[PDB]
Design a binder for these strands. Structure first.
Ligand SMILES: Nc1ncnc2c1ncn2[C@@H]1O[C@H](COP(=O)(O)OP(=O)(O)O)[C@@H](O)[C@H]1O
Ligand SMILES: [Mg+2]
Lengths: 788, 754
DNA sequence: AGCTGCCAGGCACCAGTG
DNA sequence: ACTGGTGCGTGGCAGCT
């Protein structure tokens, strides 16, 4: 096993190892001329993941070196295979110039691709956020922080406990999570994609204040509302140190951070988010969710924004009224605005690629195209009487200048890259038209020299061509070549031709090639100059992008209210919900039969409904529809009902039924307040008959009598219908069933009162439990009903 | 590409891989389907590299999709149930074609394994045993009749194939099948009066033959599977016992994972088949028993030799289809070289079955010797390029190779001659398709090329040339090589000629080797893991002393606690109270698996097991609705020979209704049915059942409060449970002191009256 | 239209002339 | 020390069919 000290290595392997040791945990692509290459175990892994050959590399002393690699022009394809598997790559490039370089040319890692810091169009999902998060734990709480690199959205929060932290990880769903080496509660995080253990020094607070002030160009973070917040700042510090280290360029689009407080949003727990199928259904897919229904936005950025609001309802009455207003003002204007807004596309990600300086030609094209829709959007929106719509008309901006620049700079449909030129347009730079001018002897000159030399020699097989390896030539067939001028110089031989070079062609080769390299460089100077001219207006460009996404959202929720018959919610001071004719938004589109609308009435005097009714009677659904109506109302949307009054809701809790059920329930009892909506679905599990019910009863009583929260409480325990009798705030409601003949009818109708009876025997009969057994069950029931 | 849609008329219901360069390209609506099933992208194009077609065909084919290749006209069709290439199968898993069919009377069913020739039919009467047969056999491809009524059974299955009604005609069926097997009638196969099943098998065989476009000389038999030959296990039971597959779709923490230490892939597949089809006939069981005990001693000697034998079943398939590539032959040779050693080790085992497996096994010495002399030690994957046939097998071939080598030797020396005659140290001789051989000088030295050298190609740093002498010897090499390659192929096709007449005996060998793999494994497993030989009794009853869950005991690193079990007709039902937390559930399932293992012929995880005849095994251990429907199936279909295992029915409905259904169920199962039953319940009110009816007793699990925890004991005790622990766990989970207090009052109040 | 085989641009290696 | 040949991934495409 070779001892491999520094001197045992070649100049190349020495250099490769310094850089490898900057990032020992992750794959390193190492630029060698036209190939990106990997070595040692990296090569063996790449070989297994990227389906390429594992080969070797000769060595004057000792062991051979395992090696794999791909040509430079295929990189993006392979990076996609790797980031789709949760893998990071450090990309190493050549900085220097081999000709002014005795040893190996100089080499830096210029970039690291990681699942959380990708900004390229090919490696992302259009309609779905891809966040980088940092997390860390204290002796009292959590610090958490998300950055979305391809928009600059930088956020900070300090969840108070395990279950709020869990709910946050579920909500943000980071593609990559940096977490501190001493994180205690690993069960929040174990089994998460993109997990990245970090050293504790990256979470040091004085360094975080330093990075973030530096970054934001401030002295303190008071203006951002986070000087207050050292737990969170330490995740933000780690997160930004990383973003920086993966990008290794400045990041002008990350110009701010905001704190997400408990009190600004309704905080749904983890069960709640799952039970309501907000963007992922219970089997993991995106069919039959809230979002499948509501989301008909016409730009990717507008669909992501919608999904964030759905997930994070604001509590701010002002903001909510504003959004509701906008939705009603724009009812009519949707069919005109939507086709036009669709042509804005994903402006937000393009400006991100603009700030990272990675934007390609078609990115500037689509940006130019976006600016071209701004006038038509301005004209439509002028007529809409709504101060909120006008603020969003105003934030949208116009950018006449920058539009006119991209029309005079890029051609109508440029190629995918700038590497191959043919991107910058005519008239933009008069030195460039002049450099193409000279490299337009390709048309005229060559055909003329050809026909001239064909006529002159009388050699009819004579052609003129170009070949990358040997340059220009004059071909002559093998059978005519013994007849060519003595002047003609052998350049390249072939099985049945002989190609030649004379001084007039080689002169024309020296000027085509060199004028073409001069013209390409210039084009790249000019194309990177588009960034210098576009970038100073970046602030307003991001505000334009966000304006347009918000518009896309509100216009969408305006169309959805109209189409699916939703009305405006009103807000009240105290806790309570009053629905007239509410429907479950999702279930009312999938069902082929018609949806039975039911009411609800929660107040402080009527703050807990014990809900009976048969299995399949519609109990769960009535509970979910309450939470979704409350949810849509607190994103500012119209709501699926004839009428809705609703008061302030701080937090929604769900428990849907061993230890986990009890623990979940403890948390409901410790953190629920009079402002929470609590959904308990068929809880209280014991080991003997009355064990678990005793527990639900005690729990219910705590919710009614001590916590006084708003509680929908579905049960099959008929014994809990005796709760109202005994408890202030508690009422019985029930889902009507109908036992005509021998079968059962599920009315999905909510009535007031306890049910006339439970229906368990009936459901069993339905499932084909033999008649003879149902007969005896009915006998014992009658026995049990005589105790009381 | 207007000659694409024309070809998708030819075969429309099949994905159409279309040659486009170094790629196969799917277009309109095959491409939609293809980018969703394989994670690759679309533009309506889709694409895959040529180097990975078998790698992308194996995915599509194990999601129930046929694929048609195109190179132009459709040159190849692979279907899921008909593949036999080793790159396209999973090494340790059966892959079946199946046909299904219905009658006024009932169902017909057939299954083929195209690689082993294992052909089987059956005639399930009710639909639930038809469902049962579909989960067990789990075809990769399902042929069903057009005007088939009960689509509910086969609706969600992958690999469905709608078929004309005439493909199920009984007279076509009998006549095909008899033609396939060389018989006038099917009486020697035991299926002549099995028309429902025959129709299914007549379709199946038709399809097989059509997909192959060959003889299938290896399918020479069919067998009826009968209801009474087997312990019937519904899908739900099969799934809850985690036999091959775990409740969470994986292959671990399963019975087959603990017990499957077979050494050959064909022996692993056979074991899994026994594990899903326990037999009622104790004769076959006493025999497997007797064999495992006979071999406990010879196991260490046998398994490394058998491991070497590999997959002789699937190689023989490829021998019968005539597709067996040189390594398939090289590894059949290796298998043969183990038979004499295998025969020596088994010589002394004093059981008549091991000696029958030893005769059946065979030796085939002169076939061993034929391939020792025919093929080289490590031949290439394909015959295509030769270097497979051995030095000294055939006179002509060595002659043609010696002429090639002497032409190729000349040319290595032509290089040293030209280079010593010119003084040009960069001169060499190479070969490619464009030029044949050529002298190559480098660019810097090429201006001193002899004037007799004719230039044919200029590279960037070299020039290449030909001379007459170079082209003359190119002729000698290429004609020789070509003749020796044509001959290699002819010689290799002649191995198929000489091997195939013994195909029957070879299949009997692979089969016998498979069983031996299984029994040698079941025997190592019994010994290693302290199992015991179960005795069988006449009337029903299970009696276990210190028995264990075979899987939980290897997986969980905690002390497994063993438990007794006494069921007879005077003690048919145990009401099981106390905590569950899987303790009850492990206890119940372990009864099922000990019974299951008894009835494949294996040893079992206990110190003693006596067990009576069992016709079915029901295990409702796992909505309220599904629980009632599974329970309803138990009550409609259980007999006094069934083992029934119920987990706490009544949960998820009112106390009284669910107590009422529990009670009534247990009555039924104990009085009417009289099945052997473990009825786990939470209802303490059911513990008054032994007092009211004969045959019922009370067992329970207890638990132990200590330090700052609870200890759920794993131990079954007589009598009803004295305690509940819902509240105890509640306390330990953080539920406020005072909520717990209130709950404790209410509990006393509710139980109080009872 | 297909199939085979040069080439890319780094670096190190290696066998032959100081 | 130089000099001039060698080898090393995958993919693009010239140069033959
Ligand atoms: N109000 C309604 N109108 C029409 N169908 C309904 C309604 N409520 C429920 N359903 C139907 O009944 C089914 C059962 O709903 P669920 O709330 O789960 O019943 P439960 O929870 O009482 O067992 C749902 O899948 C839905 O299709
Ligand atoms: Mg429910």
């Amino acid at each position: 096993s070779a001892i491999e000290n520094f001197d045992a290595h070649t100049p190349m392997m020495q250099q490769y190892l310094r850089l490898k040791a900057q990032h020992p945990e992750i794959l390193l692509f190492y630029r060698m001329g036209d190939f990106y290459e990997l070595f040692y175990d990296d090569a063996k892994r790449a070989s297994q993941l990227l389906d390429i050959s594992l080969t070797k590399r000769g060595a004057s002393a000792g062991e051979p070196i395992p090696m794999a690699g791909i040509p430079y022009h295929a990189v993006e394809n392979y990076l996609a295979k790797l980031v789709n598997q949760g893998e990071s790559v450090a990309i190493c490039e050549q900085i220097g110039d081999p000709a002014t370089s005795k040893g190996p040319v100089e080499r830096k890692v210029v970039r690291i691709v990681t699942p959380g810091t990708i900004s390229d169009e090919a490696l992302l999902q259009e309609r779905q956020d891809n966040l980088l998060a940092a997390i860390w734990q204290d002796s009292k709480g959590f610090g958490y922080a998300t950055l979305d690199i391809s928009s600059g959205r930088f956020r900070l929060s300090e969840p108070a406990d395990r279950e709020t932290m869990a709910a946050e990880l579920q909500r943000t769903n980071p593609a990559e999570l940096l977490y501190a080496e001493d994180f205690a509660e690993m069960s929040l995080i174990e089994g998460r994609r993109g997990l990245r253990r970090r050293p504790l020094w990256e979470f040091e607070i004085d360094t975080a204040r330093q990075q973030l002030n530096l970054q934001f160009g401030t002295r303190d973070l008071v203006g951002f509302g986070v000087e207050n917040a050292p737990r969170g700042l330490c995740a933000a510090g780690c997160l930004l140190q990383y973003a920086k280290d993966t990008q290794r360029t400045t990041l002008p689009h990350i110009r701010s951070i905001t704190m997400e407080r408990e009190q600004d949003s309704i905080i749904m727990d983890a069960a709640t988010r799952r039970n309501l199928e907000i963007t992922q259904n219970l089997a993991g897919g995106a069919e039959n969710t809230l979002a499948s229904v509501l989301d008909c936005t016409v730009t990717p950025m507008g669909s992501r924004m919608l999904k964030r609001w759905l997930h994070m309802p604001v509590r701010d009455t002002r903001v909510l009224l504003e959004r509701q207003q906008t939705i009603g003002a724009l009812q009519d204007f949707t069919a005109g605005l939507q086709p036009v807004l669709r042509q804005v596309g994903d402006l937000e990600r393009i400006l991100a690629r603009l700030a990272l300086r990675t934007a390609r030609p078609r990115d500037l094209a689509r940006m130019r195209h976006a600016f071209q829709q701004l006038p038509e959007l301005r004209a439509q929106l002028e007529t809409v009487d709504s101060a909120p719509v006008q603020a969003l008309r105003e934030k949208m901006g116009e950018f006449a200048e920058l539009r006119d620049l991209l029309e005079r700079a890029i051609i109508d449909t440029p190629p995918v890259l700038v590497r191959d030129g043919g991107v910058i347009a005519s008239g933009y730079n008069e030195e460039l038209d002049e450099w193409r001018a000279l490299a337009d002897g390709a048309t005229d000159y060559l055909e003329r020299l050809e026909v001239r030399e064909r006529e002159r020699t009388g050699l009819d097989t004579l052609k003129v061509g170009f070949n990358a390896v040997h340059g220009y030539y004059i071909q002559i067939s093998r059978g005519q070549s013994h007849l060519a001028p003595i002047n003609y110089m052998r350049r390249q031989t072939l099985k049945n031709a002989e190609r030649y070079i004379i001084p007039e062609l080689k002169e024309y080769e020296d000027k085509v090639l060199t004028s073409k390299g001069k013209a390409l460089a210039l084009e790249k100077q000019l194309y990177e100059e588009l960034f210098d001219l576009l970038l100073p207006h970046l602030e307003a460009l991001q505000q334009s992008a966000s304006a347009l996404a918000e518009l896309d959202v509100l216009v969408n929720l305006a169309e959805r209210a109209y189409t699916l018959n939703y009305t405006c919610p009103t807000f009240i001071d105290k806790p309570g919900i009053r629905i007239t004719e509410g429907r479950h938004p999702v279930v009312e589109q999938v069902l082929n039969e018609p949806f039975i609308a039911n009411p609800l009435n929660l107040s402080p005097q009527r703050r807990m409904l014990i809900i009976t009714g048969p299995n399949m009677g519609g109990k769960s659904t009535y509970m979910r529809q309450t939470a979704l109506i409350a949810l849509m109302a607190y994103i500012g949307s119209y709501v699926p009902a004839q009428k809705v009054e609703i008061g302030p809701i701080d937090r929604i809790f769900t428990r849907v039924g061993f230890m986990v059920e009890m623990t979940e329930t403890a948390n409901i009892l410790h953190n629920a307040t009079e402002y929470s909506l609590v959904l308990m679905d068929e809880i209280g599990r014991g080991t003997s008959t009355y064990d678990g019910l005793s527990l639900a009863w005690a729990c219910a009583e705590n919710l009614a009598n001590k916590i006084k929260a708003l509680t929908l409480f579905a049960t099959h325990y008929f014994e809990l219908t005796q709760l109202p009798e005994k408890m202030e705030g508690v009422a019985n409601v029930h889902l009507d069933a109908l036992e005509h003949g021998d079968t059962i009818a599920f009315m999905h109708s909510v009535q007031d009162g306890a049910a006339s009876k439970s229906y368990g025997l009936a459901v069993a009969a339905l499932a084909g439990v033999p008649k003879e057994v149902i007969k005896r069950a009915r006998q014992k029931l009658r026995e049990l009903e005589s105790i009381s």
